[PDB]
Amino acid sequence: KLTRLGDLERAVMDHLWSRTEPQTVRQVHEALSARRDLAYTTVMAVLQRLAKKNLVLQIRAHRYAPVHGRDELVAGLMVDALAQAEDSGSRQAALVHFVERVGADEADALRRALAELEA
Amino acid sequence: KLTRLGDLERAVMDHLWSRTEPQTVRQVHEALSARRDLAYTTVMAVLQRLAKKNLVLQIRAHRYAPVHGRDELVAGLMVDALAQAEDSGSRQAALVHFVERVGADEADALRRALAELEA
Ligand SMILES: [Cl-]
Ligand SMILES: [Cl-]
Ligand SMILES: [Cl-]
């Protein structure tokens, strides 16, 4: 399971997350050319690796769509992380330590969301 | 950071987390020997370095107990995940999604964690 994106994978998903339509290799390459000089095959290859990581889907003139949005990807990584805990006791303790390590704004965002979740 | 441990440091911490009682250098060495051929001094030395990092405590038989439990590794993995967010806006939206994604038992665990933080 992916736990972080490399800088080129991130450049890539950043373009994809900025467009509603699935994008061709050529379109991603043109976006990345703003800061990098890359081979077309390098952009192609990174798309394919991101597809193998289920972060994009190849649509068929091949186009690529992000499987998760920017925010939902982060949320999913957090879920994947909590899933590492061995049992409900350590999930509980993990969550205690987790909220100690986020900011207040973050802790409150959690509080607000939880209160909406139920009521 | 538990999430940033070297591979041998992690192998040791894994063993210690797997056992209720503090473990001798011999016990750690025997446990690691299933997957590696290491010198006794190598294990002893990594325990010493972990101790200087405050990740284990030597208990006087000389034995070693983990200072932080594996639930703190899980919390760290969550912190690292949240850190993948590109800015505060995305950071807050990901937490909302997280709360939306978790099970009810986890939400309730989260509620308990935030109450403790609150106290
Ligand atoms: Cl290249
Ligand atoms: Cl755990
Ligand atoms: Cl060795």
Side-chain angles (χ1 to χ4, degrees), chain A residues 1-3 5-119, chain B residues 2-119:
Chain A
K1 211 69 256 163
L2 177 133
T3 64
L5 300 161
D7 286 3
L8 194 40
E9 305 181 307
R10 162 96 61 205
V12 174
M13 303 302 302
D14 273 352
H15 175 63
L16 293 181
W17 286 328
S18 76
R19 298 284 184 279
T20 22
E21 303 275 299
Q23 301 286 290
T24 62
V25 177
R26 175 164 162 96
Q27 282 175 311
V28 178
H29 191 206
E30 294 173 327
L32 296 176
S33 280
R35 311 182 81 252
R36 288 170 174 78
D37 291 305
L38 303 164
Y40 180 88
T41 53
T42 292
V43 179
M44 200 184 339
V46 170
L47 284 154
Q48 297 168 6
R49 298 318 305 193
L50 288 166
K52 191 191 185 170
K53 300 185 174 187
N54 303 100
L55 299 171
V56 310
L57 192 51
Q58 170 186 103
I59 295 299
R60 306 153 216 167
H62 293 206
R63 302 196 163 256
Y64 287 86
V67 168
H68 310 286
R70 211 161 161 261
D71 305 334
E72 288 280 13
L73 175 59
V74 176
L77 295 176
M78 296 176 69
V79 165
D80 286 345
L82 183 61
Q84 303 315 301
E86 271 165 21
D87 54 48
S88 77
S90 59
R91 276 197 290 278
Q92 175 63 94
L95 289 169
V96 166
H97 290 107
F98 174 61
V99 302
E100 283 169 337
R101 290 167 69 170
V102 297
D105 289 41
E106 278 82 9
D108 294 355
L110 288 174
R111 283 189 195 94
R112 281 193 267 88
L114 286 152
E116 268 230 329
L117 188 72
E118 33 144 77
Chain B
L2 293 175
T3 61
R4 305 272 179 264
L5 298 176
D7 286 358
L8 204 24
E9 283 180 337
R10 174 56 178 279
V12 170
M13 297 297 311
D14 285 339
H15 172 60
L16 295 179
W17 288 329
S18 68
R19 292 294 190 274
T20 316
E21 281 170 11
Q23 298 285 291
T24 59
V25 176
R26 192 172 156 88
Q27 285 175 303
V28 180
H29 186 242
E30 295 296 318
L32 289 186
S33 73
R35 288 165 100 252
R36 303 165 150 92
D37 186 24
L38 299 174
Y40 182 83
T41 50
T42 296
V43 177
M44 185 191 333
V46 171
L47 286 156
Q48 290 172 353
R49 304 312 319 204
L50 285 170
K52 296 157 204 159
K53 292 178 182 197
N54 263 288
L55 297 181
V56 306
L57 175 70
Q58 197 185 74
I59 281 142
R60 313 205 157 177
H62 266 209
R63 312 175 160 272
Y64 290 87
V67 167
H68 299 284
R70 199 187 185 268
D71 59 299
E72 297 192 69
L73 173 68
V74 177
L77 289 175
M78 292 179 68
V79 164
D80 287 356
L82 185 52
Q84 287 294 290
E86 299 177 342
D87 54 47
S88 40
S90 182
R91 221 187 297 156
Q92 260 171 251
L95 292 172
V96 167
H97 289 315
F98 178 67
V99 171
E100 292 170 339
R101 264 163 145 286
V102 301
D105 290 349
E106 298 177 335
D108 277 353
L110 248 186
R111 285 180 186 106
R112 288 177 287 199
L114 290 158
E116 293 184 43
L117 183 61
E118 258 273 3

